[PDB]
Design a protein around this ligand. Structure first.
Ligand code: NAG
Ligand code: NAG
Ligand code: NAG
Ligand code: NAG
Lengths: 561, 7
């Protein structure tokens, strides 16, 4: 058989929420937190054979003898610097558990505060920050020994983050401290606020603060009487000019890369618009946007989203290609291969696997995203998928016509969106592995035991039966980076209902053989719509059945055309 | 049963 089921693990677990981490440094370690929606109880599991088997380690999370009482894990944290180490915060007690060895050994520690929210440094593996949210003071804490001892470094804090290397020096911290106005002022220290000399105000009386790569952002409120601020390369913050006749109510940073910023602007009228810096020219108007305030506040979403967001997708591996949703009353999708320079209607596929659709008539391909999905109640449905591991490969759920229907299919383009095909009729979970070399999908709704997969960019599909009995499926995932050919199917057996189930599917033999240079082509988004200006990617030709390795290192060449 | 998350 082309596909092996590497492991079937029936955790005897009835928790509704499942959080999964891959240590993933070629360590076959996988950590899983089973818990309640956001908590009454929890169970932590761990695999060392890459999901072949799972050891339940909840009993190792205790407060010692003389204190039998069971613990409840709210969240668990990983070190971005050292995948060996993890931290487990109790939800109710001011207590931790630390690990330096892939959870083979844990140490129960008391802490001065409840571990509501922790932030681990990306480089200094022993260094982290802590926050007590339901503490009247809003205290911020620091640890140098990876969470064993703590000290308090600030009070009345609204938000905070680490600096961003290399832009900010090591130990840099940005925070919003609450002002009696109810507003906040943004600080920056390197002495962890033990030194006034290194403490440094960067803005005054600001509504919100966002740190993004080179740029920094913040909304200043100016109340006039007669009836946003930007940093660039850390140069002091100055307000940006906007070309409008209508007043502005809400700001949102859609995408940040050096030299071009995408900002959604929602007005009094509840119309939302898109601007681009380098000073903000108008790119696109009436973009589907939400804020709690809010542009779409009245509706359903309010009970689902507390933080604003917009139907605006950046195709990840690329520069310049985005996909957004437009609304009037009434949803439609538009794509730009320029960074908002021009926009376009998404050309529907040429067949079904045939069908008629034309831009002049008024119909185009329409892709359902995060926001539009909640409105049509597509709670579990997939947002647009695009990853740097597979440049110019996009899979999405959407419809063909003049409007996003309730009826939706799966659409694929290995053309950065310029050309689409109809891949799957229903809605499916989907993901991919081996740097886009292989695509798996599973049907949403009725319980299945079919794993549809494809090696030629969705052109054809094959079915693999992964279970003798059909199971409900809650998710289909890969180790991030999508280099492996292992796919994890999360699901539950039929009644007795809701017993978590983790199937580990291994699809190398679908690919079969290591790729050679014969199966590689050069390709730039320029090739698709142009030539126009570039970045050139080596891609496996679509019809090549083989695998680039897990250690595949995609060669990208940047050039002045 | 509800959902599965990364992170
Ligand atoms: C167990 O430990 C936590 C903190 O160490 C403490 O708050 C709790 O009171 C202990 N259990 C009991 C029986 O109270
Ligand atoms: C809004 O919809 C109406 C009809 O539903 C149409 O006449 C009008 O052109 C639309 N406005 C925009 C901005 O597309
Ligand atoms: C998965 O299966 C393929 C082919 O059966 C094999 O080469 C590979 O070593 C396996 N990988 C894992 C993680 O078991
Ligand atoms: C390509 O040209 C740009 C400006 O035209 C320049 O900044 C860059 O250094 C050039 N690339 C290389 C590799 O020199």
């Amino acid at each position: 058989e082309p596909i092996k089921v590497y492991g079937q693990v029936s955790l005897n677990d009835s928790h509704n929420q499942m959080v999964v981490h891959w240590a993933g440094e070629k360590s076959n370690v996988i950590v899983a937190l089973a818990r309640d929606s956001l908590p009454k109880s929890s169970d932590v599991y761990v695999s060392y054979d890459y999901g072949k088997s799972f050891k339940k380690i909840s009993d190792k999370l205790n407060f010692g003898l003389g204190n039998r009482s069971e613990a409840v894990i709210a969240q668990f944290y990983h070190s971005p610097a050292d995948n060996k180490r993890y931290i487990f915060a109790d939800a109710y007690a001011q207590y931790l558990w630390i690990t330096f060895d892939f959870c083979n050994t844990l140490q129960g520690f008391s802490i001065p505060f409840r571990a509501a929210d922790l932030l681990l440094h990306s480089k200094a593996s022993n260094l982290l920050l802590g926050f007590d949210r339901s503490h009247p003071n809003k205290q911020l804490w620091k640890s140098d020994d990876f969470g064993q001892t703590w000290i308090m470094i600030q009070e009345h804090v609204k938000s905070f983050s680490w600096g961003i290397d290399p832009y900010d020096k090591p130990n840099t911290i940005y925070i919003e401290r609450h002002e009696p106005s109810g507003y906040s002022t943004v600080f920056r220290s390197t002495d962890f606020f033990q030194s006034r000399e290194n403490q440094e105000v960067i803005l005054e009386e600001v509504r919100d603060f966002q740190l993004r790569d080179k740029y920094m952002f913040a909304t200043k409120v100016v109340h006039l009487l007669g009836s946003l601020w930007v940093s660039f390369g850390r140069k002091p913050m100055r307000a940006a000019q906007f070309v409008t006749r209508h007043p502005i109510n809400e700001y949102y940073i859609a995408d940040a890369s050096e030299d071009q910023v995408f900002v959604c602007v929602s007005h009094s009228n509840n119309r939302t618009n898109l601007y681009i810096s380098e000073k903000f020219s108008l790119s696109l108007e009436n973009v589907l946007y939400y804020s709690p305030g809010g542009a779409g506040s009245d509706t359903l979403v309010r009970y689902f989203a507390n933080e604003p967001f917009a139907d605006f997708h950046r195709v990840e591996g690329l520069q310049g290609v985005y996909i957004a949703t437009l609304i009037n009353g009434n949803m439609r999708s538009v794509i730009t291969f320029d960074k908002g320079g021009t926009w376009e209607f998404l050309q529907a596929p040429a067949f079904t696997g045939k069908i008629n659709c034309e831009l002049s008539q008024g119909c185009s391909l329409h892709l359902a995203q995060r926001l539009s999905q909640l409105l049509n109640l597509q709670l579990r449905r997939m947002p647009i998928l695009s990853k740097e591991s597979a440049p110019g490969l996009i899979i999405a759920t959407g419809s063909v016509g003049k409007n996003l229907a309730s009826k939706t299919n799966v659409y694929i383009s290995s053309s950065a969106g310029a050309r689409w095909r109809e891949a799957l009729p229903g809605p499916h979970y989907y993901t991919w592995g081996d740097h886009g070399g292989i695509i798996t999908a599973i049907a949403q709704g009725m319980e299945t035991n079919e794993l549809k997969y494809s090696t030629n960019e969705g052109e054809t599909w094959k079915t693999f039966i992964f279970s003798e009995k059909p199971v409900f499926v809650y998710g289909l995932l890969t180790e991030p980076g999508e280099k492996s050919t292992v796919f994890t199917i999360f699901g539950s057996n039929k009644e007795n209902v809701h017993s978590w189930l983790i199937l580990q599917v291994n699809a190398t033999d679908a690919l079969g053989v290591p790729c050679t240079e014969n199966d590689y082509k050069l390709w730039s988004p320029s090739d698709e719509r142009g030539n126009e200006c570039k970045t050139v990617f080596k891609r496996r030709t679509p019809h090549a059945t083989c695998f680039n390795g897990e250690d595949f290192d995609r060669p990208v060449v940047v050039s002045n055309c | 049963a509800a959902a599965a998350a990364a992170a």
